């Protein structure tokens, strides 16, 4: 029933503006307020402001009085937040939440990540992590994919187009010294299956529209 | 702005156990306190509002109490999926402020990592760089040491690690370490190994490969 | 400015008796309580569950406005967790009460030369009232084991008694008009909100 779908991740040059959206469904858009919350990595959430779509009134905190403006389209049931004069401090995750007015939030968006970077979109290189050759007693083997030198985040990795999900671990991306990101996904599979079954990682980096399906198999 | 303070900052507990976390506020808010759970990459999710009212879909195991400046959240029996950061937030007028969180980990029986190692792809080698990957799989506790040794020489400044979130069912962690080397450098040395020290292992386990499938 | 019609509640020409207290639900309006709080014309203005400064900053689903007339020494009973004839048998507040009790003297309007007997209260009742319960029954009170049979008697009494409200009765037996504002917070969209803090 109640759903709030926010727009996708956004990479923006410093000193610019951005408009993030939140499409609401499952409830009267006009009777409720829409609050916006900022969260930085490693930190608690931070309330920005709320808008009442019926009369269009917005409220915010002192800090965000000038950075952010809040708008609401009752025709498409969409709440917007516009952020201006973007700095690196502004880069964060931005959530839309439904506020009945009481300042607690029962339904949240999925968040939108705002990266404020002079840097430039770069595509991942997908390399295999081939299965090792060992005794394989217990019949557990490991294999994976290395997604290297991509900017900005994120990257989605699936195994066999969603068919394989058990024992899959996708690790958090680390920031290299080059400023590019690197990430790995691995899975643990039966050893006996290695010859019979084919294992493929589908890696999609939407900012550069890079879709790569790489097959992994033992070398030589 | 009311200022808010949760304790513990951090907490580990086993399934079936009972947990209480606390929030402390500058100002009397009477009853206008809310509690959320959050997990990595995901939004916060309301658990409690008005200090006591449980939200829809929230298990009976969750309980809110308190008043004025002092508030508490209890879970009568922990479940493997209750890990995460727990935030309190007054909802007593503008501006609504949050706490700094409480990180709840599930404690479990000690589990030893499964270690695996991955030599650089031929393709990557053509690129001009070599990435060697060490994987530690499904271990508890999270604390573990990875030492990279090349021809039995300890390596520093060329490894990066990342760890997964606690498994919702297994309550285990996994870790990966990656060594990044120019091709020429990688060509100088013969044996690449990682050595894992962990509580589950009485002696550090090693996993190695001789460059070139030697 | 869709201001809350508090004024028809407070400035009603006539007020209820306590046993038959009146209630007005208030909603879809803007409420400036701060002008009401700092008035010497109110001899009582007590808020429970909330702070008088924050009242303009808070938003509520609905507001209920209960009004009646009692005598001065009885206003103490209109707080949460109080006991007495008025709190036990006429008008009872919850222990979790969230709202403001307001009261002012009404001797000029609610006194007459013989003393006004139109305002009544419930002296006897078989059980104590639940919070926000109203009971206007005039059934005869059977204190004794005698079957009253709707007949006033020695162990059988009429439930509602009357105030004197003589103009000369003196403070504490003089008439006081009470308005209880309770704040209803439900899991539903807010409809009564404080003034916009743009100011
Ligand atoms: C009851 O009526 C009186 C008028 O006799 C109201 O008093 C005035 O209220 C306005 C604001 O609405 C003030 O600006 C005036 O200064 C008030 N005048 C006096 C003499 O006090 C009063 O507001 C009404 N009561 C309620 C609860 O609304």
Author numbering:
A (entry chain H): 1 to 9, 11 to 30, 35 to 59, 62 to 72, 74 to 110, 113 to 230
B (entry chain L): 1 to 29, 36 to 57, 65 to 72, 74 to 80, 83 to 109, 114 to 234
C (entry chain A): 333 to 531
What does the paper say about this structure?
In contrast, HSW-2 showed binding to RBDs from all clades except SARS-CoV from clade 1a. Of the two HSW mAbs, HSW-1 showed no detectable competition, and HSW-2 competed with CR3022, a class 4 anti-RBD mAb. We next used cryo-EM to investigate HSW-2-spike interactions, observing two main populations of particles: unliganded intact spike trimers and a Fab-spike S1 domain protomer complex. From the latter, we obtained an EM reconstruction at 4.1 Å of HSW-2 Fab bound to the WA1 S1 domain using a crystal structure of an HSW-2 Fab-RBD complex to derive detailed interactions. HSW-2 used its six CDRs plus FWRH2, FWRL1, FWRL2, and FWRL3 to recognize the bottom of the RBD, consistent with its competition with CR3022 (class 4), and although their binding poses differed, the HSW-2 and CR3022 epitopes overlapped. To determine accessibility of the HSW-2 epitope in an intact spike trimer, we aligned the RBD portion of the HSW-2 Fab-RBD structure to RBDs from spike structures with all “up” or all “down” RBDs, finding steric clashes in both cases. The inability of the HSW-2 Fab to access either “up” or “down” RBDs in an intact spike trimer is consistent with the observation that HSW-2 showed weak or no neutralization activity despite binding almost all RBDs evaluated by ELISA. Although the HSW-2 class 4 epitope was buried in “down” RBD conformation and could be partially exposed in an “up” RBD conformation, structure alignments showed that HSW-2 cannot bind “up” or “down” RBDs in the context of a spike trimer. (F and G) Superpositions of HSW-2-RBD structure onto the RBD from a spike trimer structure showing that HSW-2 Fab is sterically hindered from binding to either an “up” or “down” RBD on an intact spike due to clashes (starbursts) with the spike S2 domain.
